[PDB]
Design a protein around this ligand. Structure first.
Ligand SMILES: [Cl-]
Ligand SMILES: [Cl-]
Ligand SMILES: [Cl-]
Ligand SMILES: [Mn+2]
Lengths: 298, 285
């Protein structure tokens, strides 16, 4: 990385952080070239790193953001703005509202500045189509152009899909897959790629744990499947793991446990959608693999 | 609550539009991300030009007849199921009904000043009743259930057309879109490129994620700058000669095609298209 690009990167981060604590609705306007530069440079970093991340503590694991940029700035207040802390996000950075651009541009800016201390996984909202998601595509063509959205899809196609923290915590957006027997299957997935409608990559971003299902059941989303509690236990024993860390679903207190606290669902976007008054959570992992949970109030 | 031109009440957890008549010179009212469940006391805000109800719980469009000067109406990401209550807004120039539950296009016959119509992410199944919108510059119908392109002949002023993520199977009905400059038909079921003879002003053509197997019938699109054809079935390298007439072409997407299996994929494109500076996601050296 050049030093002239470092100072331009510091300018982007500074302008994105000037609205900290302001009105939840104020926007930061970056030039189209600066946003594209964030997409292209971070795309090279995503491809230069494994599609299955192998991370080490300490780091803080956050859930869904859903374009709530002012709740992202709150996460960095509780946990510490980089590089004060290492971060791992579990996808779904863009959605409704008109702040999904500032959300993804700040995360990509931190990814470029701290490539080995800041990590982003791929959620089901980081797809390359508008078959199911339309909010982010609507925001791009509206503040800029449709081509800028196409550049984001190029960057989204290179995002990693799963992460293993200290060989004990398996992290992904959706959950387990009926086609996931060895971790090499995840590394075997080549990038860039669009999220398919079926297979290993699809279930890693769409599956959900269910309490009333034994084995693999149909998902009410119409995509992927749902897995039961006993499926999680055999996955942890087979691969010698201690915890599955996922997101995708909304939970009231920001985190919820499944299969006798062998799986946790992290949701870091408080007050999601309308009147459902959920909170945000952030799981910290220290050097001895001890998990603490910080809660953010809506 | 002051008396200025702009009033911005986003994420204020407001559940009722109560007591807004105090504004004497309000021109833009922003009520995004609230608990508003019905449109109510907006009558005395006659001087209103922009109304933004982005992401609320509105189920019915109503009580908007007094705003005869309204130009921009945004009721996106709500619970709307039918189009109504917009017949009095004669000077509407922008209408946003994004991500609702609208099933058909209707009650838009009086909007003679509309330049932009956003009906994306709905349940629309047919293109209907837009024959009176002769001043439309942009029509967004992405993410729906439309099966056939039709009833577009009156939109001679249309410049941008987005039909992504629908159920189309053949390109047609663009015979009178002579001023069309951007066309997006990605993620459909189109199998052949045809019906673009009258659209010479095209600068953007997106037909990715379809079932196209040969590049034909675009020799006359000399103004092409962007051509997105990823996720198709292109097999013949000789088809790229159809695009040699576009000397301002800067970007081509051809990845995840049978042509990308060639060990010299990125070189044969920039040799056949020397004007292109971006192949797929990366730039040309
Ligand atoms: Cl790149
Ligand atoms: Cl780093
Ligand atoms: Cl293994
Ligand atoms: Mn999700």
């Amino acid at each position: 990385m050049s030093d002239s690009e470092k100072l331009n990167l510091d300018s982007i981060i500074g302008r994105l952080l000037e609205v900290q604590g302001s009105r939840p609705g104020k926007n930061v306007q970056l030039t189209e070239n600066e946003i594209r530069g964030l997409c292209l440079k971070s795309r090279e970093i995503f491809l230069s790193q494994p599609i299955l991340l192998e991370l080490e503590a300490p780091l803080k694991i956050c859930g869904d953001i859903h374009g709530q940029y002012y709740d992202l700035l709150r996460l960095f207040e509780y946990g510490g703005f980089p590089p004060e802390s290492n971060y791992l996000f579990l996808g779904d950075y863009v959605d409704r509202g008109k702040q999904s651009l500032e959300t993804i541009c700040l995360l990509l800016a931190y990814k470029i500045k701290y490539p080995e201390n800041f990590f982003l996984l791929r959620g089901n909202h980081e797809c390359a189509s508008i078959n199911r998601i339309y909010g982010f595509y609507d925001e791009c063509k509206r503040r800029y152009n449709i081509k800028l959205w196409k550049t984001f899809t190029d960057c989204f196609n290179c995002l990693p899909i799963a992460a293993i923290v200290d060989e004990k915590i398996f992290c992904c957006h959706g959950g387990l897959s009926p086609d996931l027997q060895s971790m090499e299957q995840i590394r075997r997935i080549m990038r860039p790629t669009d999220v398919p409608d079926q297979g290993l990559l699809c279930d890693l971003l769409w599956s959900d744990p269910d309490k009333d299902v034994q084995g693999w059941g149909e998902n009410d989303r119409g995509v992927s499947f749902t897995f039961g509690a006993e499926v999680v236990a055999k996955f942890l024993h087979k691969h010698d793991l201690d915890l599955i860390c996922r997101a995708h679903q909304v939970v009231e207190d920001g985190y919820e446990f499944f299969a006798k606290r062998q799986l946790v669902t992290l949701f870091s976007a408080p007050n999601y959608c309308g009147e459902f008054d959920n909170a945000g959570a952030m799981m910290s992992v220290d050097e001895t693999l001890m998990c603490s949970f910080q809660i953010l109030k809506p | 609550d002051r008396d200025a031109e702009d009033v911005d009440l986003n994420h204020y957890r407001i559940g009722k539009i109560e007591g807004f008549e105090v504004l004497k010179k309000v021109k833009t009212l922003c009520l995004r991300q609230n608990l508003i469940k019905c449109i109510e006391n907006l009558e005395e805000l006659q001087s209103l030009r922009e109304l933004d109800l982005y992401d609320n719980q509105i189920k019915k469009i109503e009580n908007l007849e007094a705003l005869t000067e309204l130009e921009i109406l945004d009721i996106s990401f709500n619970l709307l199921r039918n189009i109504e209550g917009v017949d009095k807004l004669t000077r509407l120039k922008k209408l946003f009904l994004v991500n609702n539950k609208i099933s058909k296009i209707e009650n838009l016959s009086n909007l003679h000043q509309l330049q932009m119509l956003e009906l994306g992410s709905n349940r629309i199944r047919a293109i209907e009743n837009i024959d009176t919108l002769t001043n439309l510059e942009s029509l967004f119908l992405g993410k729906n259930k439309i099966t056939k392109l039709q009833n577009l002949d009156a939109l001679t002023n249309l410049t941008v057309l987005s039909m992504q993520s629908n159920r189309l199977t053949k390109i047609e009905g663009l015979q009178n879109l002579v001023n069309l400059r951007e066309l997006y038909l990605s993620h459909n079921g189109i199998e052949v490129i045809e019906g673009l003879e009258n659209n010479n002003k095209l600068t953007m053509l997106d037909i990715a994620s379809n079932r196209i197997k040969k590049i034909e019938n675009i020799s006359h699109l000399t103004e092409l700058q962007e051509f997105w054809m990823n996720d198709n079935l292109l097999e013949s390298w000789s088809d790229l000669d159809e695009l040699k007439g576009a000397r301002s072409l800067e970007t081509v997407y051809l990845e995840r095609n049978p042509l990308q299996k060639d060990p010299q994929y990125r070189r044969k494109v920039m040799l056949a298209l020397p004007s292109v500076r971006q192949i797929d996601a990366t730039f040309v050296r």
